[PDB]
DNA sequence: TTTTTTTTTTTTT
């Protein structure tokens, strides 16, 4: 008979210390819960202690015994004599933290044993469940265990700890001779004048109108980053297939249009320049592309965690686009769904320390204004995106709106929202034929 | 005693198929390994088969017996008589992939049981390991479990692999289609591109609103399967009488107006088409339909077993529909009744190894959404249905909800869940006059 | 035989505590009387204790024993040995108030039982009284019960009591010679001219668009509170990691540009400023920051109570922001969830007597208007927010919406709700480089 | 466990 491991002496010491000192109750309340006690009468005792403390009543022997007696639970836990014995057996509450740690350890061990027994029972008797069902159930149980055993600190942090961590980060950055561009370098020096590269755990939003090269600019950034860094990056282009964009990926590098790439022409003078550029992409092995239209945030998070654990973190996550992901729970309201999606993306970016660039559509009210320059009040699914994003940029081409204009080729990236950084406008040189965004080497006008 | 789960019959069928058909060995070796067999003599047999295949020796009864006798492993695996019994017990090697998948599933479940036993042992015996150490050990074990089956084909992978696949696809598709079929034909090659044919023992659920032609589409699938196979087809029409179903089938096959057939106002050419369709159906004589209302799953299972025994198996089962079956034991709880019905249908499909398509109904709240394209949550009692079903497809028609829709005559079959293929939308052409679904020959819209 | 409810152990604890500590006698006198004791000897003992305390005699073993011997009640209460037993039975008198509450509850229940017995006796023997007479008698008894058991407030308070409390408050304020910020000082002279400091138990809501510096202004307020008081402050940064918040605080206090700090391009003077700021902050050591996401109000309340207990109260609570908190009980209704969150926050603020500033987001409809200066309706789910809040301040920046605005670097803090003050707009100077808010040192503009 | 009426507040276009 395998009795589950436990420490009843630790339980009695915890209860007696609570009877002697309620001020450490939060120290007991932070570590263990009512169900953490191995013995059900001890669970009832701790529940009644929590009820007395939440009422503001001091926790002693007599009050707890009377509170249990009013509920008919005094005799169920052993009577007044058992509670007096438990109070007597505890000499001091000074080391009650170690006893609570032991109780929490025993509770975690028993929970692990129970989950393992459930997994074994489901394995011996599948009961109609297939391979996928059993694997998903096991992974869900393990995720519950891991999330229960990750919730340890989850509370206030003193200034001294926060100041030490922040100054450690500051000294780490100071010792690094990065020479500017601390984040993942975008490959655009003018962009790095404001953005200083794609900082990790940042929710960068490239929100642009359709047929503005929004996906083109995002993939230009992705390709430039892959040229610069070798950290594994991630792409989720739900809208367009990876087959098309790869040609565009070979269009920026060759600095030409696709045209013959989409068709079946063979022109191997600059086509031969591409045949060999791909090899440069071959040796990198740091881009993971999966269109997978109709994605949920859970699946995206699972894929991201998989790739990060496989190849040591993620260089850059790419999402195309925000208005394509499906959340079954909040499918009723689109704005709530977008809020949940953006929250999940921000949480994943903070978890894996990776910049996330996601594309967003806009509203038609932008073009209805006299000023067709996109601002923070023009985004489709308005509130949630502006609330949750860290960096927000707008692609503005005056040539699209006004064909007779001086900004032909000049793609204005309006930084509309940046918490850590000055908002503004960065001029570029978008090659509309070549589908290649480049830097603006012309006369940079003053932003009024 | 909790005996570990295993499938000895699947192992025997795999070994006999490898003895008879060596060319499917690469099919078998992709799915199972030597250690996947629960029985150690089967592990030795698979190891010797792998050794003979790597050495170029043919894998038959005599060569395997001689090779096992050379290593002294003939007596360890049961002997020449046992090997001959293994060869004899396998009627055909065509379905060896399903047996190998079953053996792989049993190996995965036993590995999960072993890992759970290790976890329980570490819980009962910490052996110096702290909570962090046990947490890391459990996470490492579940990481190995995930690494046992981690996407593989579903995996996006780094730039190199997807790049060499995609540029090869482009350089092949520059002017040449070169379709690879890759699936059992169900009358829709575009559908068979994703579904890869009607997978046996799978629970396929097609869901639509009433008047969306769900029964019409199911009948078209049944007709295509019947014209593309010799195995008999079984239909359950609880919603409609069998004569109306026959009229729908004749109208779909002969491409005549349903109204003219129903009213009898048919010309000589329509009569000739009807006579030809009747001749084809009387040539087949494999269509068997039951229209009894309120049928229990027990009666359906008994009749299906009767038909399979009388005809050496059934190609396809049709049920119309899920919500019309009756369970007297669960008449009080509708959701539990639906769950038990779906479980019984899945068990029957696994037992008789026949695809079963049962129609389903949606909820009204789907019409309350801005997007009326169905999802998994729109099903009535969707919780059990989504888990039990393998291939879930929805029928959507924007032309129904929009009079000025440009997609008139176009129906969207949205695969929402597929365990063995990609999800997504396939467009088809609908003839309401003929009540027929056919391949969409219009421009191929790039789904986002 | 149903015994009337009592707690003899609690009574003995009370008697022994009164023998040991007479200073809590008033605490005993507030809750219980002599007739509240179940046993007549205990009633006599409490009567003798009351007589001794009224006469000024100490309530100990010897004096009480002598008084009971002089009145001849020493033998009736158990004798000197029993009195010494009662004295010995009490280890501590600190929890004597809860024991008195227990005895009070027992007395109330016994009185209820006695009155119910009287009513049943009058029912079985009407004795000429009509149904009206018996109803009047029963209602009179229930009125007597409700009057006797609820004398300790629990209802409408008398005018005179509120008048005395209010005049005590006014005299307290008059005696205080600070003549200034009654509440926690904001660090801004013109703001404190209208707010008189951040008053305790007040709900303050700061509303602005994202990237307007609302969190920056809240951090500046936190810095001012920390520099102007020794009480600890509490910060909830659910939007940003605590490292970024600390970097913002360092940039604001040290007046160094955030770009150089983030990029690490800091000179010797900037490093000296940062080091001095760190020294001052570590001298203070009164900031506690939590950046956990999805926090329920229960966890926030528990942590706030813990910090207040550990540090003798909390000066200020900061929440960033309202819409990032999660309540599982009202996850389906966002508006009800926001209402319950705001209600719980106001309850906590009144409980701990601490100003709580929780940030909020604006709807974009205000940007649809010609005037973009915020109103009360522009907040998200503002219906409960405006009611529950004590102070509401909007942050407006015309320079954001107008490139040629003359108010560059100027922010309008529009007090839109103030229960004890006028509404109106106060101008402040904003340093985007240092991300700091300061008193506006330009010319004063008349508010029309 | 399921859907169904019905009111109410919020946000979106
Ligand atoms: N002669 C016809 N011409 C055009 N449309 C037709 C004709 N006959 C039937 N249809 C359409 O075919 C659809 C089939 O849907 P239906 O069979 O009613 O769904 P269910 O299977 O739930 O009964 C109907 O919506 C109907 O409008
Ligand atoms: N280095 C810098 N130079 C100039 N302005 C900056 C710099 N860094 C940040 N800012 C400004 O500070 C603001 C921060 O606003 P923020 O505190 O995020 O508002 P909220 O907290 O309401 O979202 C941004 O709008 C940005 O324009
Ligand atoms: F009305 Al039907 F299938 F014919 F739902
Ligand atoms: F981006 Al914020 F409060 F910092 F909305
Ligand atoms: Mg039908
Ligand atoms: Mg902020």
Short mmCIF file of N, CA, C and O in Angstrom, two decimals, chain A residues 160-232:
data_model
loop_
_atom_site.label_atom_id
_atom_site.label_comp_id
_atom_site.label_asym_id
_atom_site.label_seq_id
_atom_site.Cartn_x
_atom_site.Cartn_y
_atom_site.Cartn_z
N UNK A 160 13.78 48.40 -4.25
CA UNK A 160 15.17 47.96 -4.19
C UNK A 160 15.44 46.79 -5.13
O UNK A 160 16.48 46.76 -5.80
N UNK A 161 14.52 45.83 -5.19
CA UNK A 161 14.65 44.73 -6.14
C UNK A 161 14.49 45.23 -7.57
O UNK A 161 15.27 44.87 -8.47
N UNK A 162 13.48 46.07 -7.80
CA UNK A 162 13.22 46.59 -9.14
C UNK A 162 14.36 47.50 -9.59
O UNK A 162 14.79 47.46 -10.74
N UNK A 163 14.86 48.34 -8.67
CA UNK A 163 15.98 49.22 -9.01
C UNK A 163 17.23 48.42 -9.34
O UNK A 163 17.96 48.75 -10.27
N UNK A 164 17.48 47.35 -8.58
CA UNK A 164 18.65 46.51 -8.84
C UNK A 164 18.53 45.81 -10.19
O UNK A 164 19.50 45.76 -10.96
N UNK A 165 17.35 45.29 -10.51
CA UNK A 165 17.15 44.63 -11.81
C UNK A 165 17.30 45.63 -12.95
O UNK A 165 17.93 45.33 -13.98
N UNK A 166 16.72 46.82 -12.79
CA UNK A 166 16.78 47.83 -13.84
C UNK A 166 18.21 48.32 -14.05
O UNK A 166 18.65 48.49 -15.19
N UNK A 167 18.96 48.53 -12.96
CA UNK A 167 20.33 49.00 -13.11
C UNK A 167 21.22 47.88 -13.63
O UNK A 167 22.22 48.13 -14.31
N UNK A 168 20.86 46.62 -13.36
CA UNK A 168 21.57 45.50 -13.97
C UNK A 168 21.38 45.50 -15.48
O UNK A 168 22.33 45.32 -16.24
N UNK A 169 20.14 45.73 -15.92
CA UNK A 169 19.87 45.85 -17.35
C UNK A 169 20.60 47.04 -17.96
O UNK A 169 21.14 46.96 -19.07
N UNK A 170 20.63 48.16 -17.23
CA UNK A 170 21.28 49.38 -17.72
C UNK A 170 22.78 49.15 -17.88
O UNK A 170 23.37 49.52 -18.90
N UNK A 171 23.40 48.53 -16.88
CA UNK A 171 24.83 48.25 -16.95
C UNK A 171 25.14 47.21 -18.02
O UNK A 171 26.19 47.25 -18.66
N UNK A 172 24.22 46.26 -18.22
CA UNK A 172 24.38 45.29 -19.30
C UNK A 172 24.38 45.97 -20.66
O UNK A 172 25.23 45.67 -21.51
N UNK A 173 23.45 46.90 -20.87
CA UNK A 173 23.41 47.63 -22.13
C UNK A 173 24.62 48.55 -22.27
O UNK A 173 25.15 48.73 -23.38
N UNK A 174 25.08 49.14 -21.16
CA UNK A 174 26.21 50.05 -21.20
C UNK A 174 27.50 49.32 -21.54
O UNK A 174 28.33 49.82 -22.31
N UNK A 175 27.70 48.12 -20.97
CA UNK A 175 28.88 47.33 -21.28
C UNK A 175 28.87 46.82 -22.71
O UNK A 175 29.95 46.65 -23.30
N UNK A 176 27.70 46.56 -23.28
CA UNK A 176 27.62 46.11 -24.66
C UNK A 176 27.95 47.27 -25.60
O UNK A 176 27.31 48.32 -25.53
N UNK A 177 28.94 47.11 -26.47
CA UNK A 177 29.23 48.16 -27.46
C UNK A 177 28.37 48.00 -28.70
O UNK A 177 28.88 47.75 -29.79
N UNK A 178 27.05 48.15 -28.53
CA UNK A 178 26.13 47.98 -29.64
C UNK A 178 26.20 49.12 -30.65
O UNK A 178 25.77 48.94 -31.79
N UNK A 179 26.75 50.27 -30.23
CA UNK A 179 26.87 51.47 -31.07
C UNK A 179 25.51 51.90 -31.62
O UNK A 179 25.36 52.21 -32.80
N UNK A 180 24.51 51.91 -30.74
CA UNK A 180 23.16 52.22 -31.15
C UNK A 180 22.46 50.99 -31.72
O UNK A 180 23.04 49.91 -31.87
N UNK A 181 21.18 51.19 -32.06
CA UNK A 181 20.26 50.16 -32.53
C UNK A 181 20.29 48.97 -31.58
O UNK A 181 20.82 47.90 -31.91
N UNK A 182 19.75 49.16 -30.38
CA UNK A 182 19.75 48.10 -29.37
C UNK A 182 18.81 46.96 -29.76
O UNK A 182 19.11 45.79 -29.51
N UNK A 183 17.67 47.29 -30.36
CA UNK A 183 16.74 46.26 -30.77
C UNK A 183 17.21 45.53 -32.02
O UNK A 183 18.31 45.77 -32.54
N UNK A 184 16.36 44.61 -32.49
CA UNK A 184 16.65 43.91 -33.73
C UNK A 184 16.67 44.91 -34.88
O UNK A 184 15.67 45.58 -35.15
N UNK A 185 17.81 45.00 -35.55
CA UNK A 185 18.06 46.06 -36.52
C UNK A 185 17.15 45.91 -37.73
O UNK A 185 17.05 44.82 -38.31
N UNK A 186 16.48 47.00 -38.10
CA UNK A 186 15.51 46.96 -39.19
C UNK A 186 16.17 46.98 -40.55
O UNK A 186 15.53 46.67 -41.56
N UNK A 187 17.45 47.35 -40.61
CA UNK A 187 18.12 47.53 -41.88
C UNK A 187 17.88 48.88 -42.53
O UNK A 187 18.40 49.13 -43.62
N UNK A 188 17.12 49.76 -41.88
CA UNK A 188 16.87 51.11 -42.36
C UNK A 188 17.44 52.07 -41.32
O UNK A 188 16.92 52.15 -40.20
N UNK A 189 18.50 52.79 -41.69
CA UNK A 189 19.18 53.67 -40.76
C UNK A 189 18.28 54.82 -40.32
O UNK A 189 18.31 55.23 -39.15
N UNK A 190 17.49 55.35 -41.25
CA UNK A 190 16.54 56.41 -40.91
C UNK A 190 15.49 55.91 -39.92
O UNK A 190 15.08 56.64 -39.01
N UNK A 191 15.03 54.67 -40.10
CA UNK A 191 14.10 54.08 -39.15
C UNK A 191 14.78 53.85 -37.80
O UNK A 191 14.17 54.07 -36.75
N UNK A 192 16.04 53.42 -37.81
CA UNK A 192 16.77 53.20 -36.57
C UNK A 192 17.17 54.51 -35.90
O UNK A 192 17.63 54.49 -34.75
N UNK A 193 17.03 55.64 -36.59
CA UNK A 193 17.23 56.93 -35.93
C UNK A 193 16.14 57.18 -34.89
O UNK A 193 16.40 57.80 -33.85
N UNK A 194 14.92 56.71 -35.15
CA UNK A 194 13.82 56.85 -34.19
C UNK A 194 13.60 55.54 -33.43
O UNK A 194 13.61 55.52 -32.20
N UNK A 195 13.39 54.44 -34.16
CA UNK A 195 13.03 53.18 -33.53
C UNK A 195 14.21 52.50 -32.85
O UNK A 195 13.99 51.75 -31.89
N UNK A 196 15.43 52.74 -33.33
CA UNK A 196 16.65 52.09 -32.83
C UNK A 196 16.54 50.57 -32.91
O UNK A 196 17.01 49.84 -32.03
N UNK A 197 15.92 50.08 -33.97
CA UNK A 197 15.74 48.66 -34.16
C UNK A 197 14.52 48.12 -33.43
O UNK A 197 13.92 48.77 -32.59
N UNK A 198 14.16 46.88 -33.78
CA UNK A 198 13.00 46.22 -33.19
C UNK A 198 13.37 45.69 -31.82
O UNK A 198 14.05 44.66 -31.70
N UNK A 199 12.94 46.39 -30.78
CA UNK A 199 13.24 45.97 -29.42
C UNK A 199 12.47 44.69 -29.10
O UNK A 199 11.35 44.51 -29.58
N UNK A 200 13.05 43.78 -28.31
CA UNK A 200 12.32 42.56 -27.94
C UNK A 200 11.14 42.87 -27.04
O UNK A 200 11.10 43.90 -26.36
N UNK A 201 10.15 41.97 -27.07
CA UNK A 201 8.90 42.07 -26.33
C UNK A 201 8.10 43.32 -26.68
O UNK A 201 7.35 43.84 -25.85
N UNK A 202 8.24 43.82 -27.91
CA UNK A 202 7.51 44.98 -28.37
C UNK A 202 6.46 44.57 -29.39
O UNK A 202 6.72 43.76 -30.29
N UNK A 203 5.26 45.12 -29.24
CA UNK A 203 4.15 44.85 -30.15
C UNK A 203 4.16 45.94 -31.22
O UNK A 203 3.47 46.96 -31.09
N UNK A 204 4.96 45.73 -32.26
CA UNK A 204 5.05 46.68 -33.36
C UNK A 204 3.89 46.41 -34.32
O UNK A 204 3.65 45.26 -34.72
N UNK A 205 3.16 47.46 -34.67
CA UNK A 205 2.01 47.34 -35.56
C UNK A 205 2.29 48.17 -36.80
O UNK A 205 2.45 49.40 -36.72
N UNK A 206 2.34 47.50 -37.95
CA UNK A 206 2.39 48.18 -39.24
C UNK A 206 0.96 48.18 -39.78
O UNK A 206 0.52 47.23 -40.42
N UNK A 207 0.22 49.25 -39.49
CA UNK A 207 -1.17 49.39 -39.90
C UNK A 207 -1.20 50.26 -41.15
O UNK A 207 -0.77 51.42 -41.12
N UNK A 208 -1.70 49.70 -42.25
CA UNK A 208 -1.74 50.41 -43.52
C UNK A 208 -2.99 50.01 -44.29
O UNK A 208 -3.62 48.99 -44.01
N UNK A 209 -3.33 50.85 -45.27
CA UNK A 209 -4.45 50.56 -46.15
C UNK A 209 -4.10 49.40 -47.08
O UNK A 209 -2.93 49.08 -47.28
N UNK A 210 -5.11 48.73 -47.63
CA UNK A 210 -4.84 47.70 -48.64
C UNK A 210 -4.21 48.30 -49.89
O UNK A 210 -4.43 49.47 -50.22
N UNK A 211 -3.42 47.48 -50.58
CA UNK A 211 -2.66 47.85 -51.78
C UNK A 211 -1.74 49.04 -51.50
O UNK A 211 -1.62 49.98 -52.28
N UNK A 212 -1.07 48.97 -50.34
CA UNK A 212 -0.06 49.94 -49.97
C UNK A 212 1.30 49.30 -49.74
O UNK A 212 2.21 49.99 -49.24
N UNK A 213 1.48 48.04 -50.09
CA UNK A 213 2.72 47.34 -49.80
C UNK A 213 2.96 47.13 -48.32
O UNK A 213 4.11 47.17 -47.87
N UNK A 214 1.89 46.93 -47.55
CA UNK A 214 2.03 46.70 -46.11
C UNK A 214 2.73 45.37 -45.85
O UNK A 214 3.71 45.30 -45.09
N UNK A 215 2.24 44.30 -46.48
CA UNK A 215 2.91 43.01 -46.41
C UNK A 215 4.29 43.09 -47.05
O UNK A 215 5.24 42.47 -46.57
N UNK A 216 4.41 43.88 -48.12
CA UNK A 216 5.69 44.08 -48.78
C UNK A 216 6.70 44.72 -47.84
O UNK A 216 7.85 44.28 -47.74
N UNK A 217 6.28 45.76 -47.11
CA UNK A 217 7.19 46.43 -46.19
C UNK A 217 7.54 45.55 -45.00
O UNK A 217 8.70 45.51 -44.56
N UNK A 218 6.55 44.82 -44.47
CA UNK A 218 6.81 43.91 -43.36
C UNK A 218 7.80 42.83 -43.76
O UNK A 218 8.74 42.52 -43.02
N UNK A 219 7.64 42.28 -44.96
CA UNK A 219 8.55 41.23 -45.41
C UNK A 219 9.92 41.79 -45.79
O UNK A 219 10.92 41.09 -45.64
N UNK A 220 9.97 43.05 -46.24
CA UNK A 220 11.25 43.72 -46.45
C UNK A 220 12.00 43.84 -45.14
O UNK A 220 13.20 43.57 -45.07
N UNK A 221 11.28 44.23 -44.08
CA UNK A 221 11.86 44.29 -42.74
C UNK A 221 12.35 42.92 -42.28
O UNK A 221 13.44 42.80 -41.71
N UNK A 222 11.55 41.89 -42.53
CA UNK A 222 11.88 40.52 -42.15
C UNK A 222 13.15 40.05 -42.86
O UNK A 222 14.07 39.52 -42.22
N UNK A 223 13.22 40.28 -44.17
CA UNK A 223 14.40 39.92 -44.95
C UNK A 223 15.64 40.69 -44.53
O UNK A 223 16.72 40.09 -44.45
N UNK A 224 15.51 41.99 -44.25
CA UNK A 224 16.64 42.78 -43.79
C UNK A 224 17.15 42.28 -42.45
O UNK A 224 18.37 42.19 -42.24
N UNK A 225 16.23 41.96 -41.54
CA UNK A 225 16.60 41.43 -40.23
C UNK A 225 17.29 40.08 -40.37
O UNK A 225 18.27 39.81 -39.67
N UNK A 226 16.80 39.24 -41.28
CA UNK A 226 17.42 37.94 -41.52
C UNK A 226 18.82 38.11 -42.12
O UNK A 226 19.73 37.32 -41.83
N UNK A 227 19.00 39.12 -42.96
CA UNK A 227 20.33 39.45 -43.47
C UNK A 227 21.24 39.90 -42.34
O UNK A 227 22.43 39.55 -42.30
N UNK A 228 20.70 40.68 -41.40
CA UNK A 228 21.50 41.19 -40.29
C UNK A 228 21.73 40.14 -39.22
O UNK A 228 22.87 39.78 -38.93
N UNK A 229 20.65 39.64 -38.61
CA UNK A 229 20.80 38.69 -37.51
C UNK A 229 20.52 37.27 -37.98
O UNK A 229 19.87 37.03 -39.00
N UNK A 230 21.04 36.31 -37.22
CA UNK A 230 20.84 34.89 -37.49
C UNK A 230 19.92 34.22 -36.49
O UNK A 230 19.79 32.99 -36.51
N UNK A 231 19.30 34.98 -35.59
CA UNK A 231 18.34 34.42 -34.65
C UNK A 231 17.11 33.93 -35.41
O UNK A 231 16.68 34.61 -36.36
N UNK A 232 16.54 32.77 -35.06
CA UNK A 232 15.38 32.26 -35.81
C UNK A 232 14.14 33.14 -35.72
O UNK A 232 13.65 33.41 -34.63
#
